[PDB]
Amino acid sequence: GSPGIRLGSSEDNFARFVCKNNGVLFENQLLQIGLKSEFRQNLGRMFIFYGNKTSTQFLNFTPTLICADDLQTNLNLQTKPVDPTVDGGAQVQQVVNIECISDFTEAPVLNIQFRYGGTFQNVSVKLPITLNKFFQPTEMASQDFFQRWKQLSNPQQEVQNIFKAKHPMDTEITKAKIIGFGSALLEEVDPNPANFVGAGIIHTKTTQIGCLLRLEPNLQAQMYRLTLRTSKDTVSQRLCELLSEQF
Amino acid sequence: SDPFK
């Protein structure tokens, strides 16, 4: 995507919120931005916490959400304004309500502008609202999983990515990551015990996409073969892109 | 053997 060093960028900590909903998204010497999200069906609720790290009160504290044209048609975001005055040492909360319309790839950008000590401060950070947040885990017996896996005929609906692992292959962490990703983590479906099989329905207003995922660790090459088989080619592609960056 | 193909 964007070339150049990603430090002090709009996506420094973006990847950290694909499988978890709580934590600090951004922090400079004046402001700390924390998050707490909750999702259900094709909806979500993201609490954004703005902490004033100084002994001085912030003014004109202004957070705004920015979405590209395509993203607009696939994702709907709503939020109530927060008080523009933030006491030094104080923390203020903002709630963002989410509704997924259709599968999407782009991410919303949160822009924050405010005054401190009489100076204009500007921050832009990508908000971690990703397609997987709208997963309904679907537990199912092995037999049912394979029947569904073999119902795929359109080659474009299958997307495979073979990539190098970025983190250790710590089983419980990977399980937590997959569970955190959203789908159900089906136990004992793939005869290969090292493989992870997930099944879920990506819920969007306009279409429910049945998703089956197979994550095949390659311990030696420290790579994974991720296969997404879903009822929609673009969903297969995006879920593949996202999950790929997580291991 | 492998139910994935």
Side-chain angles (χ1 to χ4, degrees):
Chain A
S2 303
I5 303 175
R6 310 314 287 169
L7 178 57
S9 78
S10 61
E11 44 179 48
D12 281 14
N13 305 306
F14 185 84
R16 297 191 180 299
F17 298 78
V18 175
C19 300
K20 71 176 176 61
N21 301 317
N22 291 287
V24 174
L25 175 66
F26 173 95
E27 186 173 355
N28 58 28
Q29 300 182 294
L30 311 175
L31 168 75
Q32 184 189 76
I33 302 175
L35 303 174
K36 167 180 288 297
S37 299
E38 308 176 316
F39 297 82
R40 187 163 196 164
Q41 198 58 34
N42 63 317
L43 316 175
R45 175 159 299 180
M46 174 180 278
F47 293 74
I48 303 175
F49 301 94
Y50 305 100
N52 186 326
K53 303 172 56 177
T54 79
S55 66
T56 298
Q57 187 182 65
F58 292 157
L59 306 177
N60 304 80
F61 200 73
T62 309
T64 60
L65 307 170
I66 305 176
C67 300
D69 299 64
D70 289 358
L71 182 55
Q72 289 275 54
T73 71
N74 305 309
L75 190 60
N76 190 294
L77 303 176
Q78 289 176 57
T79 184
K80 298 297 182 64
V82 61
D83 186 301
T85 296
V86 188
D87 286 4
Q91 180 180 72
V92 299
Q93 155 203 289
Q94 170 165 60
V95 181
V96 179
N97 301 299
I98 308 155
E99 169 185 40
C100 177
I101 303 309
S102 189
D103 59 301
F104 60 97
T105 288
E106 298 302 302
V109 169
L110 166 65
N111 177 256
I112 301 178
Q113 289 177 44
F114 64 100
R115 284 165 56 206
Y116 170 72
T119 70
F120 160 74
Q121 297 296 315
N122 175 61
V123 173
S124 284
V125 55
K126 294 182 173 181
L127 281 186
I129 295 183
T130 52
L131 190 54
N132 62 290
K133 297 295 181 185
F134 307 101
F135 252 135
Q136 172 193 335
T138 58
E139 301 296 333
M140 64 180 78
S142 179
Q143 164 179 54
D144 296 321
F145 177 86
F146 289 104
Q147 287 176 171
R148 286 158 172 152
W149 184 272
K150 295 179 180 177
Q151 296 175 318
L152 178 154
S153 51
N154 181 340
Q156 303 292 62
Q157 299 188 332
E158 181 182 67
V159 175
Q160 304 180 63
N161 184 35
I162 300 178
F163 63 93
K164 299 188 300 174
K166 297 168 189 172
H167 311 298
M169 296 188 196
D170 292 328
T171 299
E172 287 306 303
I173 297 298
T174 299
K175 285 189 170 304
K177 276 176 170 298
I178 292 180
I179 288 298
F181 190 65
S183 78
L185 178 61
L186 304 186
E187 303 296 56
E188 298 181 359
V189 175
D190 184 322
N192 191 314
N195 294 343
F196 300 83
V197 168
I201 302 172
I202 280 298
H203 287 307
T204 78
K205 183 183 188 177
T206 67
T207 185
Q208 309 324 303
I209 309 96
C211 302
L212 305 175
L213 65 83
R214 187 189 186 189
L215 179 59
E216 300 174 82
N218 180 311
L219 283 179
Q220 175 157 54
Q222 283 296 285
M223 291 189 84
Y224 289 92
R225 179 162 186 170
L226 178 62
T227 303
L228 263 295
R229 278 204 169 186
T230 78
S231 44
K232 192 175 184 177
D233 59 355
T234 55
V235 170
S236 300
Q237 180 58 59
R238 179 53 173 169
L239 288 180
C240 192
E241 302 181 1
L242 289 165
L243 200 53
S244 291
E245 304 296 300
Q246 291 305 307
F247 308 93
Chain B
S1 177
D2 183 13
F4 274 110
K5 199 59 186 171

